[PDB]
Amino acid sequence: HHSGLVKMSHPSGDVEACMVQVTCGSMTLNGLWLDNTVWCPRHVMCPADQLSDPNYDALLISMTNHSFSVQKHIANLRVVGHAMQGTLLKLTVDVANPSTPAYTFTTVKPGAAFSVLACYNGRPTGTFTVVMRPNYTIKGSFLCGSCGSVGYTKEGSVINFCYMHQMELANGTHTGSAFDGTMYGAFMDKQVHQVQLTDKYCSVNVVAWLYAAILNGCAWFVKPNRTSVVSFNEWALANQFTEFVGTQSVDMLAVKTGVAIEQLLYAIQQLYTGFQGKQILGSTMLEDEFTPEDVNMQI
Amino acid sequence: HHSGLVKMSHPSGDVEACMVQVTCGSMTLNGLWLDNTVWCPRHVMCPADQLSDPNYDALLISMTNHSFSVQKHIANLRVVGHAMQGTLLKLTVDVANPSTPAYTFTTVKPGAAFSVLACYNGRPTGTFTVVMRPNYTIKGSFLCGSCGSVGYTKEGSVINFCYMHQMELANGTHTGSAFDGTMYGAFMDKQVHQVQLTDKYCSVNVVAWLYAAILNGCAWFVKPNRTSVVSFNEWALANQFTEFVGTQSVDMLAVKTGVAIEQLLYAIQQLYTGFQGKQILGSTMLEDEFTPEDVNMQIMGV
Ligand SMILES: *[C@H](O)[C@H](C[C@@H]1CCNC1=O)NC(=O)[C@H](CC1CCCCC1)NC(=O)OC1CCC(F)(F)CC1
Ligand SMILES: *[C@H](O)[C@H](C[C@@H]1CCNC1=O)NC(=O)[C@H](CC1CCCCC1)NC(=O)OC1CCC(F)(F)CC1
């Protein structure tokens, strides 16, 4: 029995209408056009010469409004302002985006999922869902020209913008900025080798996934035994798991199933070292990319 | 090394602007509004007590234009005509959808992937990608209210509409209609237990996935040895694989890597038994849900 638990993205329509192309001299990439503001990565200012260690203060001083050009493919936009905020540019333009959705800015924490609209030359090309990993990188699919693609969640018709794509690490994973301008995971926007920390299992997501299993008729791993939040978090330090942190969302799953979070924490301690011949939701390894909210929504 | 080979859907905005709610008595579901036409599953006509063997032909005659209420959410639309085409209703409305995309109506074949815009009460809520399986079912996530949700691809500026959701089977998979009004597979729009055929591995997609592995620096499974297409296809009949049919998209993966299809058809015959402790792209079994087009786009960008 297919659980129907699949990797699901938000409808991208509201964001597609905000995507523009931004050019600065020879560099071009994607930006996000909200009201009279265009957001893009500041490295649009770098020539190919100096990608190893750009001087962003000197680059910005050297610029005028006329240094930037914004075009819409998904309108006639003139840049009337330019400023830096962390690793992002905040360009001001003269026309307001008529299709600006209600929005907010949020900084996601490890374990949370968000949707990415991948864009090339301001044209949306694909959408996928990613989980912010405990080492503050994401997987997903990003090729040359995708910088400035944005990640977002939704609450109603309210879009919470949370990610603007910046770079790929040598291991093929990715990182970007929040719209407060800080890079996820302290990475520097310099083309200089930087090492991701080790990845961990997102405990709270693993729990949701086993709840999903129980809801689909797979509960052989539920015993009466319990492990406390506090004991489990001590066990997790030593075994490559994140701190467990309960939510209203996870509690709903306990009520639906009759199974308590503590029972699954114990279950995870045992399953960590193997399934011993058994399957769960078609896997032989614990899965940590489905959040509690995914399981509530989809089952 | 992370491949960058992920489940990726088309941007759904072109399709969001076409989704409406269609109501007929008790039943409510989603519809697809293109120009002056609204398409929806015909069982919206069906009263809840008569779902096991509905007489659609008599249900339709009994309706008037006022029996159908159509609401946009993402105005009210006046129904000025109604007709049945196979398992779908074709409603005519007095306003042409001002945001109709260029579109076609092509039925997809097994192994082909498409994007789904899952909707409830005419409100788009999620998008995901599915593969039409050899037994004409799809996986995905569909709950009460999802009927009339649509699946599509986009080629150039043209959206191809290929799926309108109708039902969930006992094993949790799903099926529906093509926009010519046929149901995929044998299925009928009757709420009755129905025999779905045995599933199979999608050979061409397994080859694309092996090519993605080669491109990502993982080719331990490649040997000089080859199996021809005709020989592989005869073997496939006895081992739960589809016939392999090459395409230009696969040929490009072969040109780019230097590895011939026939070397990968040979490899599949050896990897079917198991990988014997190794992995391919973080997998210990063969993956058949990524197409050659996916691999060309996501790894090479074509
Ligand atoms: C922008 O579109 C592009 C996106 C990349 C291309 C491949 N996959 C992606 O996600 N970003 C870059 O190409 C990025 C540009 C530079 C510009 C100067 C400031 C810093 C970013 N370079 C990049 O991602 O290269 C990696 C190399 C390995 C590293 F660890 F050093 C980080 C930078
Ligand atoms: C329409 O929105 C709905 C979508 C279903 C509900 C649960 N998941 C889905 O994908 N479709 C139906 O409910 C469908 C309607 C009938 C009405 C007469 C014409 C033919 C289809 N019935 C259906 O899917 O029955 C299933 C329910 C799930 C099951 F496992 F119990 C087997 C029968």
The full 3-state SS of A105-130, as one line of letters, equals ECCCCCCCEEEEEEEECCEEEEEEEE
Residue of A nearest to B116 (CA): A8
Burial A89-101 (b: 16+ CB within 10 A, else e): bbbebeeebeebb
Tell me the C-alpha distance between A241 and A230, whole Å.
13
User: B142, B198 in Cβ contact below 8 A?
Assistant: no
Beta bridge partners of B267: none
Burial B59-79 (b: 16+ CB within 10 A, else e): beeebeeebbebebebeebeb
Q: Which helix (H) or strand (E) holds A234?
A: helix A229-238
Tell me the C-alpha distance between A167 and A29, whole Å.
12
Cβ of residue A256 lying under 6 Å from some atom of ligand 1: no
Q: Count other C-beta atoms under 10 Å from residue A248's C-beta.
A: 9
Q: Count other C-beta atoms under 10 Å from residue B231's C-beta.
A: 14
Give the SS3 label for residue B117.
strand
The end-to-end CA distance of chain A, in Å, is 13
Q: How many angstroms separate the Cα of B282 from the Cα of each of B201, B216, B293?
A: 19, 12, 21
Tell me the C-alpha distance between A203 and A134, whole Å.
11
Q: Which residue has the tokens 């997987």?
A: A139
Helix axes A203-215, A248-257, angle to 10 degrees: 30
CATH number of B203-300: 1.10.1840.10
Burial of A135 (0-12, 13-18, 19+ CB in 10 A): middle
> Looking at domain B12-93, which of 2.60.40.10, 2.40.50.140, 3.40.50.300, 2.40.10.10 is its CATH number?
2.40.10.10
Cβ of residue B59 lying under 6 Å from some atom of ligand 2: no
Radius of gyration over alpha carbons of chain B, in Å? 22
Active site residue B46: no
Q: Is the dihedral of CA B147, B153, B159, B162 positive or negative?
A: negative
Token couple for A237: 């330090």
Active site residue B147: yes
Q: How was this structure determined?
A: X-ray
Smallest Cα–Cα separation from B33: which of B128, B116, B97? B97
User: A281, A218 in Cβ contact below 8 A?
Assistant: yes
Give the SS3 label for residue B5.
coil
User: B155, B57 in Cβ contact below 8 A?
Assistant: no
The answer to whether A156 contacts chain B (CB < 8 Å) is no
Instruction: Spell out the long-range contacts of A71-79 with Cβ–Cβ below 8 A and sequence spacing 24 or more.
Output: A71/A20, A71/A21, A71/A23, A71/A122, A72/A20, A72/A21, A72/A33, A72/A122, A73/A20, A73/A21, A73/A121, A73/A122, A73/A123, A74/A16, A74/A17, A74/A19, A74/A20, A74/A122, A74/A123, A74/A124, A77/A20, A77/A33, A77/A38, A79/A38
Name the phi and psi angles at B296, rounded to 5.
-60, -40
Strands of the sheet containing A37-41, edge to edge, are A76-77, A68-71, A19-24, A27-34, A37-41, A88-93, A79-85
Residue located nearest, by CA, to atom 11 of ligand 1: A167
Furthest-apart CA atoms within chain B: distance in Å = 68
Tell me the C-alpha distance between B20 and A296, whole Å.
25
Burial of A52 (0-12, 13-18, 19+ CB in 10 A): exposed
Residue located nearest, by CA, to atom 2 of ligand 2: B147
Phi-psi bin for B204: left (phi > 0), alpha (psi -120 to 50), beta?
A: alpha
Q: Count other C-beta atoms under 10 Å from residue B218's C-beta.
A: 18
The DSSP output letter for B51 is: -
CA B65 to chain centre: 31
Architecture of domain A13-93: Beta Barrel (2.40)
CA B41 to chain centre: 16
Q: Count other C-beta atoms under 10 Å from residue B102's C-beta.
A: 10
Resolution of the determined structure in angstroms stands at 2.3
Inter-chain CB proximity B2 and A171 less than 8 Å: yes
Token couple for B115: 């994007």
Contacts of A6 (CB under 8 A, 6+ apart): A298, B128, B139, B140, B141
Contacts of A295 (CB under 8 A, 6+ apart): A5, A208, A209, A211, A212, A215, A253
Smallest Cα–Cα separation from B131: which of B114, B154, B107? B114
Pairing of the two strands A103-105 and A158-168:
parallel
Burial of B128 (0-12, 13-18, 19+ CB in 10 A): buried
Q: How many CA atoms lie within 13 A of A48 on its CB side?
A: 3
CATH homologous superfamily of A203-298? main proteinase (3clpro) structure, domain 3 (1.10.1840.10)
Contacts of B82 (CB under 8 A, 6+ apart): B60, B63, B64, B65, B67, B68, B89, B90, B91, B92
The DSSP output letter for A100 is: P
Ligand with an atom nearest the CA of residue A54: 1
Tell me the C-alpha distance between B8 and B147, whole Å.
22
Beta bridge partners of B124: B119
Pairing of the two strands B150-155 and B113-120:
antiparallel
Active site residue A172: no
Query: Helices H, strands E: what count in chain B?
Result: 7, 13
Q: Where are the beta strands (DSSP E) in chain B?
A: 19-24, 27-34, 37-41, 69-72, 76-77, 79-85, 88-93, 103-105, 113-120, 123-131, 150-155, 158-168, 174-177
Inter-chain CB proximity A172 and B9 less than 8 Å: no
Inter-chain CB proximity A2 and B139 less than 8 Å: yes
